[PDB]
Copies of this chain bind each other. A is one copy, B any other.
Amino acid sequence: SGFRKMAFPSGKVEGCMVQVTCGTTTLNGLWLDDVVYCPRHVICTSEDMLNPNYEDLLIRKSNHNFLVQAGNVQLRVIGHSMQNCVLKLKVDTANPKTPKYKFVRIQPGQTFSVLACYNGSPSGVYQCAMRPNFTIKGSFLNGSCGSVGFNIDYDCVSFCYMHHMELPTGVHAGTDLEGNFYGPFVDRQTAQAAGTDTTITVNVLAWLYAAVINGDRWFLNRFTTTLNDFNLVAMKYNYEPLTQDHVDILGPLSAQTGIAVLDMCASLKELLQNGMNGRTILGSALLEDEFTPFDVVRQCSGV
């Protein structure tokens, strides 16, 4: 028993982290097989990184300006091709330690682990959530660009996030490995505004089932609602809507606790309306929404 922010094992990825240097500009990149993916803003200078139009700058070719060192090995680059906001560099050796890997675009609220990497070496690993306003609140210093976010389903590693920028509000913005930014952000050195962020109701309901599994009962009540009745009190508190798709994803947790999803909604609705009453749940006086229903199942049932 117990619960915690339990990130995936990093090692499997530790193997696909390299350092890319374009001129004197250096950031990380992910090396799968005979190809290295990194953010397209390595080519720039400080002077270029305010409104750069990168199209021309890569047609300013020179494969030989692209330095990659993968630990001991000095990777030769044998190609230079740009897919949106990621550069995909052909290299001479295929990463011998390449696992099974997919690329997926995550929907807001879904979770991933991040390997914080600096100069192709990693300092630590943590778990993030995709904020409904397409931001991640992680831990990134300069040189973190090219750090990657991933989920491990069984054999396959899903790479969901590639880090690009810290915004003025202090949170983060990046891309899938197709260089397709989440949110309204660009590869430019300009303050950007995320939008408005919202608490993820399915994840809170996940975390409340989490508390139950570790023998916290103080929040439970003999009341229920409809989804309709819940969904107004959600809108009111800038809590996401809960749908039938959201109700279906919690069933495992319902089954294993024996509390019906709509009753837990009754518990969440009274918490929203009266506050956390001085008390903590899972040692947090704050509603936590950075645990997915899957992640509860995983952490509370190994895997």
Contact = CB atoms under 8 A, between A and B. Distances in A.
Interface of A: 1-15, 115-116, 118, 122-128, 137-141, 143-144, 166, 170-172, 214-215, 280, 283-286, 298-303
Contact of A9 (B5, B14, B214, B280): B14
Given A9-B125, A10-B125, A11-B10, A4 B302 contact: no
Q: How many copies does the complex hold?
A: 2
B10 A299 contact: no
B138 A4 contact: yes
Nearest to A140: B2
A11 B8 contact: no
**Which one of A11, A14, A124, A298 has the greatest number of beta carbons of chain B within 10 Å?**
A124
A154 to B, nearest CB: 11
The 3 closest A-B pairs by CB, nearest first: A11-B11, A6-B124, A285-B285
Contacts of A7: 7, 10, 124-126
Contacts of A215: 170
